[PDB]
Symmetry: C3
């Protein structure tokens, strides 16, 4: 049986030795999908940034039309909105700053992973 036991041991070591190579292959794949998720987020953030510039342009557009229509009505003859707009504008800038930080870390850690 010492004889037989070495046969068994060797068989188990081989089949499990297989498991490891399996696991390392899958782990290889998952590294790719992970970088894809990280890049996707940098993209999603840049769109969000750009959309904010767009939103700032339209608020300015609206403010100008307020002036022009106000004057026209005088020739012929609001503050809450300004607050809520200022507040939400502040928030979106925080969330963007934080999202920029979070994006640098995630990219750094993903870079560290390639060792």
């Amino acid at each position: 049986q010492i004889e037989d036991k070495i046969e068994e041991i060797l068989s188990k070591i081989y089949h499990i030795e297989n498991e490891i190579a399996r696991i390392k292959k899958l782990i290889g794949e998952a590294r790719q999908l992970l970088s894809g998720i990280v890049q996707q987020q940098n993209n999603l953030l840049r769109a969000i940034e750009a959309q904010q510039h767009l939103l700032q342009l339209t608020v300015w557009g609206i403010k100008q039309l307020q002036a022009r229509i106000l004057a026209v009505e005088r020739y012929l003859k609001w503050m809450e909105w300004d607050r809520e707009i200022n507040n939400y504008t502040s928030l979106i800038h925080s969330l963007i700053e934080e999202s920029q930080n979070q994006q640098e870390k995630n990219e750094q850690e993903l870079l560290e992973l390639d060792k």
Copy 2:
């Protein structure tokens, strides 16, 4: 050779025993980058929410200017846009509700993972 075989077996078991510790280290790292990706998404969603409040504020701003300019033109003397705006507004609210749900699950599952 029984002697020699036990030498080989022991050598393989050691080198593969190494593989496992390697794999567990990398798996440790990847847990971090994964929480970073999940947090990043909560951030990206909150920005998107805020931007929607901002967009709602500007649509209201625009509607008011429509009233004021309409009146001024009467003193002196559209519906599709309202539809498309109502529709897209409905959609963004769904996508946000779903994104809020998806964010709770992902955070729960990520929490379950620390066992």
Copy 3:
């Protein structure tokens, strides 16, 4: 000691054989959270798309009010903004096109992973 060594070898092979099953369980879990992160991103992108249609609707709304107020002022009696709006609009369309591509790959790779 040949006797004893086979006892040790068998003990190590069992405890490490455990490690593998452990690792495969955790790997099972992490596959779920990964699909959840990928779906979440498809959602975040669709919201961003919709918000862009919304932004396009409001820029058009603003342009119309510019015409109506311009005419009213003539009866009675800008180009940079148009540029910046056109530019940022172009960018957001690129970032969205790229984000759509990135989303297909990530979904494909995640699909490949289930072998």
